[PDB]
Each structure stands twice: as structure tokens, then as C-alpha cells.
Amino acid sequence: VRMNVLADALKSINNAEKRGKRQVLIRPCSKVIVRFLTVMMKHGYIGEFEIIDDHRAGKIVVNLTGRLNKCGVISPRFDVQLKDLEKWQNNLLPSRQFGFIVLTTSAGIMDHEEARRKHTGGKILGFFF
């Protein structure tokens, strides 16, 4: 069946990106997904999005700029120490100049960078660049 909603979502927006479309319908949605897209959005990789509320599960409609190359998830969610982060981002990310690992932490959901500031570890979600 469908598990890891996040994964499917990101596949969707990336596929709609490669094709070169303007908008996406990603369904269903979660708070996790939402905050995720938010973290992406603040850096500008995506844009502004609207949550259509339904009485079961929300649908998210997303506006796009071509700036997003790859958007991905890492399943399973890996427990990542502060020491370990380096190896990870050297593996996943295209350059040390840009791109972000998204981790869920006790502090909240955020960038690898923000967590290097807050001095916290956590579980890994995904990445984009």
C-alpha cells in the first residue's frame, strides 16, 4: 500500500519539475510535508503553496520556479549524530556551496546548517538542490 507519504510527495513535485510544469497537485498531505515545503520555500527553491482542506486529508497545490533540480527523501529515516553530518552532506549534496539536508530534530524541522547552529542532532528526512 502507500507508506511514507513524504516520499511520494517529493517524487511528484520533482517529476512535475523535470517535465517543466507550473503547478502541482500533491496528495495527500501531512504537517511534516507542510513544514518541509516551508523550509524549502524560505530559501526560494520552490515558491508559495496553498493547502486545500478536505475532511479526510488535505491536498497541497504548489507553485513552482525552475530552480529546483532534485528533491528527494531518505528512507528509512536515519539517526544522525553531529559528527556524522559531514559525511552525509559530502555524500548527498552536489557542492559545499549549496543544497540542504532536511532533518527532523527535537528543536524542530530544519536545514543541516540551522542544526549546526542550534548544536543538535536528529533523524534525517530528505534533501534538495
Partner RNA sequence: UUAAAGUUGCUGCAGUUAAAAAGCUCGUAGUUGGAUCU
Partner RNA sequence: CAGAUACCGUCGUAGUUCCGACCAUAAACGAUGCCGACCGGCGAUGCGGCGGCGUUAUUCCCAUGACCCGCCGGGCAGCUUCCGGGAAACCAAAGUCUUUGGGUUCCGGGGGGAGUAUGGUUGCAAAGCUGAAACUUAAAGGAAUUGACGGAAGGGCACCACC
Binding site for RNA (CB under 7 A): 1-5, 7-8, 11-12, 14-16, 18-19, 28-32, 56-58, 69-70, 72-76, 91-92, 94
Q: Which does 81 bind (CB under 5 to 8 A by kind): RNA, another protein, none?
A: none
Q: Which residues contact another protein (rule: CB under 8 A)?
A: 20, 44, 65-67, 69, 75-76, 94-98
Residue whose C-alpha is closest to residue 49's, from 78, 67, 81, 23:
23
CA dist 15 to 4, 59, 71, 104, Å? 17, 17, 9, 24
Gap between the Cα atoms of 48 and 74, Å rounded: 24
**Least Å from the CB of residue 84 to RNA:** 12
For another protein, the closer of residues 3 and 56 by Cβ is 3
**Least Å from the CB of residue 95 to another protein:** 4
Q: Which does 57 bind (CB under 5 to 8 A by kind): RNA, another protein, none?
A: RNA
For residue 102, give the C-alpha cell. 532536511
